[PDB]
Amino acid sequence: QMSFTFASPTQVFFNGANVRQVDVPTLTGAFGILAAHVPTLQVLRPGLVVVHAEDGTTSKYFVSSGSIAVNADSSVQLLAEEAVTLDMLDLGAAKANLEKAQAELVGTADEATRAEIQIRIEANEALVKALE
Amino acid sequence: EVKLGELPSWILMRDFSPSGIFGAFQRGYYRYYNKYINVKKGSISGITMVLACYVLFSYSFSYKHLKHERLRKY
Amino acid sequence: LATFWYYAKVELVPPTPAEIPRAIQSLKKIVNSAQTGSFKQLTVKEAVLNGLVATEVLMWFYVGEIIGKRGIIGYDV
Amino acid sequence: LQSIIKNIWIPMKPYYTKVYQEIWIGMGLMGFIVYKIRAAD
Amino acid sequence: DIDTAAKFIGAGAATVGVAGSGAGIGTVFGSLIIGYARNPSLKQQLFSYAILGFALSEAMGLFCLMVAFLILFAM
Amino acid sequence: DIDTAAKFIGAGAATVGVAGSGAGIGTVFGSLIIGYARNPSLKQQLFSYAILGFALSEAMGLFCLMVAFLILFAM
Amino acid sequence: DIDTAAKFIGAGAATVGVAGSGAGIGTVFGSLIIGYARNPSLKQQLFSYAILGFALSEAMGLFCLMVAFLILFAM
Amino acid sequence: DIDTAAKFIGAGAATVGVAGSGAGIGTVFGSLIIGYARNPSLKQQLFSYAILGFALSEAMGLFCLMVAFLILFAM
Amino acid sequence: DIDTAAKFIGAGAATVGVAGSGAGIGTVFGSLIIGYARNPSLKQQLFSYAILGFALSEAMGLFCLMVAFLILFAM
Amino acid sequence: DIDTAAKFIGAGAATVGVAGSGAGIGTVFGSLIIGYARNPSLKQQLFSYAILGFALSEAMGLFCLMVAFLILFAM
Amino acid sequence: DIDTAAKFIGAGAATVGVAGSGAGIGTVFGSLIIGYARNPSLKQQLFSYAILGFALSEAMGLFCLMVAFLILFAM
Amino acid sequence: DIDTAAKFIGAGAATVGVAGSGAGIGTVFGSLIIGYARNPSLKQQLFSYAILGFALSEAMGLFCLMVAFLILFAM
Amino acid sequence: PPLPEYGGKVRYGLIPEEFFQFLYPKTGVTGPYVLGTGLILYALSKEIYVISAETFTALSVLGVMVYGIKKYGPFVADFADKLNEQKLAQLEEAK
Amino acid sequence: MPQLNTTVWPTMITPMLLTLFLITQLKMLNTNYHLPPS
Amino acid sequence: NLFASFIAPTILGLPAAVLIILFPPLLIPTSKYLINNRLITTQQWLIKLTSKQMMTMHNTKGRTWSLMLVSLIIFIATTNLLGLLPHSFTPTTQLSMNLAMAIPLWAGTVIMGFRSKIKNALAHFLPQGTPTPLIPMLVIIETISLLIQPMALAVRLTANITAGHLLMHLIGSATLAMSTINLPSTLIIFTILILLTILEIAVALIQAYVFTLLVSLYLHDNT
Amino acid sequence: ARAERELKPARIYGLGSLALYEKADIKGPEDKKKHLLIGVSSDRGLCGAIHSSIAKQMKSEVATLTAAGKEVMLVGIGDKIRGILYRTHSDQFLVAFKEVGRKPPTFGDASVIALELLNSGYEFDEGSIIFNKFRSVISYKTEEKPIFSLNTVASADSMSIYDDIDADVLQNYQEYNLANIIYYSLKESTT
Amino acid sequence: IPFDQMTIEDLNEAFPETKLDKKKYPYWPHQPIENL
Amino acid sequence: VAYWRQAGLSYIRYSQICAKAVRDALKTEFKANAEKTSGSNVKIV
Amino acid sequence: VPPVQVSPLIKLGRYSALFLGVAYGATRYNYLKPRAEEERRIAA
């Protein structure tokens, strides 16, 4: 019943597909969407996205940001700015960038650049935790 | 072993020492374990029998309290 | 279901009036062994076997007792 | 005194000497409490 | 006699303890209502959990009832 | 007599136990309100559940009432 | 006399049971607040349900009150 | 005398019933906080509703108080 | 004397009623915590309201305390 | 005797304290419903926590029961 | 004597009132858990409010305890 | 004697006060469920707060228990 | 040393086939069964096995155990076997 | 309450200490989990 | 009469409680083999799962208690399960054994937290962001909480197992008294008894796990 | 050429972005004054009737909006449209852009344009984007998509059925959809 | 030796990598819990 | 209201930072191509 | 499995002891009934 549409500016992972459950890391917490879910629209934060197909297999991607919209007709549109499959990433670079961002944080003093640093820190933390 | 012998001097022939009874109990434990538990494709009966003997041993010492709830009087 | 009776007709049957001689023969054999004291040759395996069939007939006496008092759990009175 | 201290005390040494030390102090406390209880009964 | 009297009193007292099971079932189903209104595709599994919760909550309440009878009839 | 007296006392005590049903219905309805405000298209299915919850919650409370009568009239 | 005495005691006891209706009101009129804050369009549709819930919740509480009078005046 | 004694006892018992109003006011003034934190532009209607809820919740509690006086002074 | 005795009993009973104010403050703040975690820029109204709720909730509880003294000292 | 009498009374009183465990299990198994309805892929980790909460909540209630027996049988 | 007797009774009664603080502290932390799960960045600010709420909630409960001692030792 | 009798009565009464800890622990372990279902990546920090809340909530309840013993054994 | 591939052939999970095959020559096939029923009748008749609440708790726990076995016996058995075969395959692949 | 019969308390304390701290821990120490091969 | 199942069992005058307490470990055989029978396979799998679930949260100092805690969670569990057998004596129903399991463990944990870590150990008596006018009370609170913890442990185990067993026994007695009266009512009460037995199996496992988890959380708090 | 290949996923993505405003049926407010007008073109000439069509549509819309008294501001994505419109429309102008057309447009460009449109201090109550919807190698059509502000989506009645919605989530979603629609226009105007 | 009659010690003899580091982790399970 | 919104950022900036952080954590086999397909060339005037 | 005919001595012992048990049960029933009712009456 659920028509799923997972997309990126350059790639279409799903299009009108019929899956059973999609977990998303909304900025207001994580939640899972199945058929007939209550209509909502949300914006994402860096995190995993697990798509469960009817056959019982799970496809795990990682999205940096974007939007999710589940509609009255059980039609889900998930548009991610940078959606990468998990195998395209590495743990060492994530940990190193996390350390660099933490160092810049303890070094920085201005509010806006501190917020930018903290955002990068959160992205890298979600990275290292999603990888392993 | 017993089930083969028919002599009462066998009773005195056994080792009725702490090490002797310890070894007899260990031998029985290993015989049971190797016939019923220590086999691949084993069953649950190898444990249910021990649990049954345990329930029996429990009812044993519980009889002294359970004989006061007798239905009849004779 | 029915195989129980299929076996009972063989082994759960009142003894026929023709086979009591063989029974008293087994009894006289056992009492002879008791007289001579030759039961010591009986290895304890068969001795336990005989004790178990003895407890069997004793259980038969007790089920007769409970059917004779018209009560299962002790004496109703 | 053989195969006892070979199978009972050899493996348990690193735990009985360094790990469970405060456990032994607590055991002393528990024994003292149980003795004080069984005393005033 | 004062014995039967206090038996009645303690029976009523132990009976008071069913308010907990009452309030418990309220939350178990109220939250079931909310959870179904959120993700209706999981109605069956939620209803399962619901029963489980209820089956425990009222259980505790029933316990009190036994004590009541344990005081009123067993004593 | 002390018997009728303690009957009255235990009756009031057992009657106390209806507070649980009161609170239970309150939460069940409160949560029905919330759930309908979230997914009004599920109003009917939710309302059904609501009744069910209520039908159990107050039920427990009613139980206490029986004990009250069980003490006040049946004894 | 001990009869009137225990009548007073049981009356107070049965009166205790109104706490359930009190807490019921809080949840209903609290969940009504939340539900209206979420979908103010259905303001009227919800307020209806609210009353219904209240009309039942306090009802149960009122029941206790009857028992109180049933003990204090009817007996 | 035992009459005044049980009057005091029943008065305290009936006074117990204010816990319901306490918890009730609590949920309402809490859910009001949440609802305002959600849709602050709706503070007017919510606060109104809040009072209404409170005005009923504590009301039930006050009822118990009357019974207390109804036992302590009117009797 | 039985009079002072039942005064003590009724005082303790009326004192029981503070549990409602306790649970009230709990939600009044619990929900304040949640509401601030949602919309922190509105801490002003979220807190003001909090106090208001508290100022009423515990108030009801305090009422019980008066009855306690009203029984223990005023009588 | 008055001793056994007050033993019965105190036993019922201590038994009252199970309402807390009742309401506790309801919240634990209800919030479990909600949390599963939100993130069903965490059903396992949530159910675990649920049990833990329950295993503590009812525990406290059981404590009261001991006191009951501690008054009714141990004394 | 009946005086010490009713002192014990009123002490237990006044002790009952700690259930409110129990439920109160519980909600203050349950809501702290939720609020932190929402906006973990404010963890420090949230914890502060939590303590404040707790510091008041249990406070009310403690009050009851004083009355208990005020009846058991001061009288 | 009436002294031991009222000791039993007050012990049961003080034991009643554990319902608050029961309901409290349930809230901390229910809101923990919800908060984990919302932001599972904080499982560790949330479970910490949970314990803290529990460690206080039941604490208050345990206080009542002391009074019980303080009446039953220390007196 | 390798392990034998089967156990001891217990009947009803309580009695091994050794007892039945040993009683078979003298009293046939229904001999052990009539021994069991005679013993149980004499036990619950001479008040050896008194009947109380423990009897019904025993019936309940025995029913729960038998249902649990008959339901989740194949699962745990083949799960242990799957663990062993997985370890064995992983080992042989490392050879 | 038999739990309060403080006469038979050491009979419960001693074998528990012998079982929980010596026997069971020795049976655990024999349960070893080797590292996986290459 | 009613508590005849919690009295220290004696057979022929000997304190048979010793054998009942020593028996549980006899159900956990061990083997030096690499591939062994089904029993040891499943039991090693269960011990692995339990160790992973319990010890993961701890640092390098806490994990040294692994052998302890796992052993604990095994012993209790087995005992509790063995308690559900008919006519059995459950040694966890005794306050003695639970106290002797709780006071040593919690006491050693607080002691190891006080020997080292003494500054933070005394600091844990106060949460981080506590305001000033409330500093004193929230110390007296935490002291009594820390002092009641071992009691709470032992009683939470005892009270639970004892009540479970007593209640199963009482419902069994009800079934007995309903045998000669309405048979459908007998079947209903028997079904209630079966559901209660399942609940009691669950509560046995859960109480074992909760005792273990609370001791482990104290250890983590002092390591 | 390659743009016809990179359009299919981009078309799917942009239409999936807009599918919400299509399903919930947001109608936009017809009573407000502040209007933003983005036109998409390139920096290169010799396109034919592309920049002319964009400029004609922008001029006609500016005329019909100012006739109703609505203060319009213009944004030109591409130097061609800014050059064509700067003389006759200079007062009505907020931001322009360059370096479009030489390289295929990417989401980074759309994000930059969205940034500079938000960091401009011009709270537009409504907006519209005008591009050249590509139909076939011979046929294109100057199309125009709407762009709603926060208050439009928030105050819409049909938006009540959507869940966990507050001003913050709607703000973030609005910004992301602005970027998405700019990207969609950029990928359509390069064909 | 086939792997069904092999002792953990014989396995450690055949693959010295499978041996547990009784020096870095002297206490059970002689290895970090995550790799368990 | 997240922290960066209090700081004055916008979800476009948040998304840019997050996408950049995910692109940097890419293995060098994909990093150059991914940075190419998502690089910005537009310039404000 | 083919049945086995039990030795005649065991069958004769079985049925004999069975009949003796019926007789003994009847005799002890009739013997205990009077004293049973007498003690039941004398208890009150």
From Swiss-Prot, chain M:
The modification N6-acetyllysine is found at K95. One of its GO terms (molecular function) is proton transmembrane transporter activity. Keywords: Acetylation, CF(0), Hydrogen ion transport, Ion transport, Membrane, Mitochondrion, Mitochondrion inner membrane, Transit peptide, Transport. One of its GO terms (biological process) is substantia nigra development. It is found in: Mitochondrion; Mitochondrion inner membrane. It comes from the Eukaryota. The modification N6-succinyllysine is found at K87. GO terms for cellular component: membrane; mitochondrial inner membrane; mitochondrial matrix; mitochondrion; nucleus; proton-transporting ATP synthase complex. Signal peptide: none annotated. The keyword Transit peptide applies. Belongs to the eukaryotic ATPase B chain family. Subunit b, of the mitochondrial membrane ATP synthase complex (F(1)F(0) ATP synthase or Complex V) that produces ATP from ADP in the presence of a proton gradient across the membrane which is generated by electron transport complexes of the respiratory chain. ATP synthase complex consist of a soluble F(1) head domain - the catalytic core - and a membrane F(1) domain - the membrane proton channel. These two domains are linked by a central stalk rotating inside the F(1) region and a stationary peripheral stalk. This is ATP synthase peripheral stalk subunit b, mitochondrial. The chain holds residues 45 to 139 of 256 of the full protein.
UniProtKB/Swiss-Prot annotation, chain N:
GO terms for cellular component: mitochondrial inner membrane; mitochondrion; proton-transporting ATP synthase complex. One of its GO terms (molecular function) is proton transmembrane transporter activity. It is linked to Mitochondrial complex V deficiency, mitochondrial 2: A mitochondrial disorder with heterogeneous clinical manifestations including neuropathy, ataxia, hypertrophic cardiomyopathy. Hypertrophic cardiomyopathy can present with negligible to extreme hypertrophy, minimal to extensive fibrosis and myocyte disarray, absent to severe left ventricular outflow tract obstruction, and distinct septal contours/morphologies with extremely varying clinical course. Cardiomyopathy, infantile hypertrophic: An infantile form of hypertrophic cardiomyopathy, a heart disorder characterized by ventricular hypertrophy, which is usually asymmetric and often involves the interventricular septum. The symptoms include dyspnea, syncope, collapse, palpitations, and chest pain. They can be readily provoked by exercise. The disorder has inter- and intrafamilial variability ranging from benign to malignant forms with high risk of cardiac failure and sudden cardiac death. Belongs to the ATPase protein 8 family. It is found in: Mitochondrion membrane. This is ATP synthase F(0) complex subunit 8. Its main location: mitochondrion. The chain holds residues 1 to 38 of 68 of the full protein. It comes from Homo sapiens (Human). It is a single-pass membrane protein.
UniProtKB/Swiss-Prot annotation, chain O:
It is a multi-pass membrane protein. SUPFAM superfamilies: F1F0 ATP synthase subunit A. Keywords: ATP synthesis, Cardiomyopathy, CF(0), Disease variant, Hydrogen ion transport, Ion transport, Leber hereditary optic neuropathy, Leigh syndrome, Membrane, Mitochondrion, Mitochondrion inner membrane, Neuropathy, Primary mitochondrial disease, Retinitis pigmentosa, Transmembrane, Transmembrane helix, Transport. It catalyses: H(+)(in) = H(+)(out). The chain crosses the membrane at residues 3-23, 65-85, 94-114, 135-155, 161-181, 186-206. It is found in: Mitochondrion inner membrane. GO terms for biological process: proton motive force-driven ATP synthesis; proton motive force-driven mitochondrial ATP synthesis; proton transmembrane transport; response to hyperoxia. It comes from the Eukaryota. Disulfide bonds: none annotated. One of its GO terms (molecular function) is proton channel activity. GO terms for cellular component: mitochondrial inner membrane; mitochondrion; proton-transporting ATP synthase complex. InterPro entries: ATP_synth_F0_asu, ATP_synth_F0_asu_AS, ATP_synth_F0_asu_bact/mt, F0_ATP_A_sf. Component of the ATP synthase complex composed at least of ATP5F1A/subunit alpha, ATP5F1B/subunit beta, ATP5MC1/subunit c (homooctomer), MT-ATP6/subunit a, MT-ATP8/subunit 8, ATP5ME/subunit e, ATP5MF/subunit f, ATP5MG/subunit g, ATP5MK/subunit k, ATP5MJ/subunit j, ATP5F1C/subunit gamma, ATP5F1D/subunit delta, ATP5F1E/subunit epsilon, ATP5PF/subunit F6, ATP5PB/subunit b, ATP5PD/subunit d, ATP5PO/subunit OSCP. It comes from Homo sapiens. The gene is MT-ATP6.
Curated annotation (Swiss-Prot), chain P:
Component of the ATP synthase complex composed at least of ATP5F1A/subunit alpha, ATP5F1B/subunit beta, ATP5MC1/subunit c (homooctomer), MT-ATP6/subunit a, MT-ATP8/subunit 8, ATP5ME/subunit e, ATP5MF/subunit f, ATP5MG/subunit g, ATP5MK/subunit k, ATP5MJ/subunit j, ATP5F1C/subunit gamma, ATP5F1D/subunit delta, ATP5F1E/subunit epsilon, ATP5PF/subunit F6, ATP5PB/subunit b, ATP5PD/subunit d, ATP5PO/subunit OSCP. One of its GO terms (biological process) is ATP biosynthetic process. Isoform Heart is expressed specifically in the heart and skeletal muscle, which require rapid energy supply. Isoform Liver is expressed in the brain, liver and kidney. Isoform Heart and Isoform Liver are expressed in the skin, intestine, stomach and aorta. One of its GO terms (molecular function) is RNA binding. It is found in: Mitochondrion inner membrane. One of its GO terms (cellular component) is mitochondrial matrix. This is ATP synthase F(1) complex subunit gamma, mitochondrial. The gene is ATP5F1C.
